[PDB]
């Protein structure tokens, strides 16, 4: 199998209801104060291989 | 700060310290924590640190 063909989502603060699909492939940023006090930082891509 | 082979110790207790005021600080190269959500550090009590 491919080395990087499967990725797990390192995401939080959105505890999902049972049997919920989480396909919002978005770079997790906030653009507000609770991320280094600026926009564009702490923009961690949730998926990790 | 001393050398890596002679690093410095400190024991701390009987404190009421806010960690939220430190997490939002951007003066750090990296702040990543293991197994414990930093956002919840204000809702936990510990014997000592």
From Swiss-Prot, chain A:
Impact upon substituting residue 45 to S: In strain: Lambda/C.37, Omicron/BQ.1.1, Omicron/XBB.1.5, Omicron/EG.5.1
Mutating residue 7 to Q: what's the consequence? In strain: Omicron/BA.2.12.1
Impact when changing residue 39 to D: Increased replication in human TMEM106B overexpressing cells
Listed disulfide bonds for this chain? 35-43
Q: Where is this region: Immunodominant HLA epitope recognized by the CD8+?
A: 3-11
Give positions of region: Receptor-binding motif. Answer: 1-49
What effect on the protein does mutating residue 39 to Q have, as reported in its record? Answer: In strain: Kappa/B.1.617.1
Give, from the UniProt record, the effect of changing residue 45 to L: Increased resistance to neutralizing antibodies and human covalescent sera neutralization
Please give the residue ranges the record annotates as the region Disordered.
Answer: 10-45
* Subunit field text: Binds to host ACE2. RBD also interacts with the N-linked glycan on 'Asn-90' of ACE2. Cleavage of S generates a polybasic C-terminal sequence on S1 that binds to host Neuropilin-1 (NRP1) and Neuropilin-2 (NRP2) receptors. Interacts with host integrin alpha-5/beta-1 (ITGA5:ITGB1) and with ACE2 in complex with integrin alpha-5/beta-1 (ITGA5:ITGB1). May interact via cytoplasmic c-terminus with M protein. May interact (via N-terminus) with host bilirubin and biliverdin, thereby preventing antibody binding to the SARS-CoV-2 spike NTD via an allosteric mechanism.
The job of this chain, per UniProt, is described as:
Attaches the virion to the cell membrane by interacting with host receptor, initiating the infection. The major receptor is host ACE2. When S2/S2' has been cleaved, binding to the receptor triggers direct fusion at the cell membrane. When S2/S2' has not been cleaved, binding to the receptor results in internalization of the virus by endocytosis using host TFRC and GRM2 and leading to fusion of the virion membrane with the host endosomal membrane. Alternatively, may use NRP1/NRP2 and integrin as entry receptors.
Please report the name of this protein according to its UniProt entry: Spike protein S1
Q: Which organism is it from?
A: Severe acute respiratory syndrome coronavirus 2 (2019-nCoV)
**What fragment of the full-length protein is this?**
446 to 494 of 1273
């Amino acid at each position: 199998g491919g080395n990087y063909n499967y990725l797990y989502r390192l995401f939080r603060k959105s505890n999902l209801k049972p049997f919920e699909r989480d396909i919002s492939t978005e770079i997790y940023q906030a653009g507000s104060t609770p991320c280094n006090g600026v926009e564009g930082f702490n923009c961690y891509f949730p998926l990790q291989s | 700060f001393a050398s890596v082979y002679a690093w410095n110790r400190k024991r701390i207790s009987n404190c009421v310290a806010d960690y939220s005021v430190l997490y939002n600080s951007a003066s750090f190269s990296t702040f990543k924590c293991y197994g414990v959500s930093p956002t919840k550090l204000n809702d936990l009590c510990f014997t000592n640190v």
